[PDB]
Amino acid sequence: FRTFPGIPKWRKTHLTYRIVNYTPDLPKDAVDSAVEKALKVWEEVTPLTFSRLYEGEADIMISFAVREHGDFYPFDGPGNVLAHAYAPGPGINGDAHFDDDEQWTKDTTGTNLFLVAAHEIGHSLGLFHSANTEALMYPLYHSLTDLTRFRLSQDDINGIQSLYGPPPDSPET
Amino acid sequence: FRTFPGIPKWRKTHLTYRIVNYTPDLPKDAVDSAVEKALKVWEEVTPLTFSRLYEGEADIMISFAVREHGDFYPFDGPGNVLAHAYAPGPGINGDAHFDDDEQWTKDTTGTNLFLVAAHEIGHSLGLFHSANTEALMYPLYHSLTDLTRFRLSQDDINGIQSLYGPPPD
Ligand SMILES: COCCN1CCCC[C@H](NC(=O)[C@H](CC(C)C)[C@H](CCCO)C(=O)NO)C1=O
Ligand SMILES: [Ca+2]
Ligand SMILES: [Ca+2]
Ligand SMILES: [Ca+2]
Ligand SMILES: [Ca+2]
Ligand SMILES: [Ca+2]
Ligand SMILES: [Ca+2]
Ligand SMILES: [Zn+2]
Ligand SMILES: [Zn+2]
Ligand SMILES: [Zn+2]
Ligand SMILES: [Zn+2]
C-alpha cells in the first residue's frame, strides 16, 4: 500500500455520501447498488459507517462526468482514465468522479461500476496506489470474470486498517 | 420574437441530440420524455428533425449541472437561474444545461422539466428572449399549472419560421 502525503484520513467514523447525478448507461438502481456495495467493502474491514444524503453537502460527493466538468482535472474521452477521486478533507476532498465516456456496467461487459467505485472509495478514504498488483489499489482495472472472487487483498486491508483500524465488533487473528 | 446577434443558425435541418447524464430528482424516462416533448414542440412548426445519439458528440448536448461545471457560467443554487443554453454552432454551441439545485418535476410541484427544456431548446435553435408575455421565449417562469392548455405562442412560431421555415407541406 501507499497513502497520501503525511496521512490524510478522516477524523470521525460516520461519513456521508451523495450521488449527485446518474449515468445514461445503467438504471438508477444499478448505480445505487454498486455504490452501496463499494462502501460496504471498506465498512466491513474498518470502524467506518456511511450514510446517504439526498440534498446538501456530503463528505463523499459522487458524480458522473464527461471531459470538462468543473474541477482542475478534465477527463479523457472513451478509454484511458476511467475515473478519479480525492483524498480526505473538506470540499472537493473526499469526492469521487466517474468518467461517463466509459461504459459503466453491472457485470464484466464494459467498465465495472462496483470495482471502480471500490477503488476510488479507497482514494476518498486515504489510500493511494499500491505496488501490489493483486491489490484493489493498484492503478489498473484488470481483466476479470468472477465478481464473487471479489475480496480485498491483504495489502488493502493493511492500508485501510493502518489508517483507521479494524471493525469494533471484530476479533483479530 | 427576437434572435441572436449575427443570426446564428443550424445550416442543416436534421439535428442530433444526446442526454449526457440524469437527475436524481426524476425517473430516467421522465427525463427522456420531457426532452422529446421539448424537441417536438419545435419540430411541429419547422422542417426540423431530431435523432438521439447515445455516444459521440451530438449537436445538442443536454446535461444536468450544479454550481461550477463544464463552462464559464456556474449555476447558482436553488431558484433564480434554472437552466441555460447556447446558440447554434459547434462545440458547446447548441447545448443546454440544467441547474440540478432545482427540483425537476413532470408536474408543476417543483420546476417543470418540459417547460424549461422547451425554452432552452428555443435558445439552442436560434431564438433569443421575446418581448411577448405570452411567448415561450419570454424570459419569465410562471409556475404554470395549466400545461394542460399549453400552446406555442404565435410569436414563437413566427420567430422559428423566420429561421427555418414552416413544415414542408
Ligand atoms: C478498461 O481499461 C482498463 C485499463 N485502464 C485503461 C488504461 C489507462 C489506465 C487505467 N487506469 C485508470 O483510469 C484509473 C482507475 C482504475 C484503476 C479503476 C486511474 C487513473 C490512473 C492514472 O492517474 C485511477 O487510479 N484513479 O484513481 C485503466 O485501468
Ligand atoms: Ca476516459
Ligand atoms: Ca467532499
Ligand atoms: Ca457512459
Ligand atoms: Ca453542440
Ligand atoms: Ca438555480
Ligand atoms: Ca435536484
Ligand atoms: Zn473531476
Ligand atoms: Zn486510483
Ligand atoms: Zn453551463
Ligand atoms: Zn432563456
Curated annotation (Swiss-Prot), chain A:
Positions bound to Zn(2+) 1: H69, D71, H84, H97
UniProt: Ca(2+) 1 binding residues: D25, D100, E102
Chain residues that bind Ca(2+) 3: D76, G77, G79, V81, D99, E102
Active site residues according to the UniProt entry: E120
Residues binding Zn(2+) 2, per UniProt: H119, H123, H129
PTM info: Directly cleaved by HTRA2 to produce active form.
Subcellular compartments: Secreted, Extracellular space, Extracellular matrix; Nucleus; Cytoplasm
Comment field on protein domains: The conserved cysteine present in the cysteine-switch motif binds the catalytic zinc ion, thus inhibiting the enzyme. The dissociation of the cysteine from the zinc ion upon the activation-peptide release activates the enzyme.
Sequence similarity: Belongs to the peptidase M10A family.
Disease tied to this protein: Coronary heart disease 6: A multifactorial disease characterized by an imbalance between myocardial functional requirements and the capacity of the coronary vessels to supply sufficient blood flow. Decreased capacity of the coronary vessels is often associated with thickening and loss of elasticity of the coronary arteries.
Protein's name in the database: Stromelysin-1
Lineage of the organism: Eukaryota, Metazoa, Chordata, Craniata, Vertebrata
Gene: MMP3
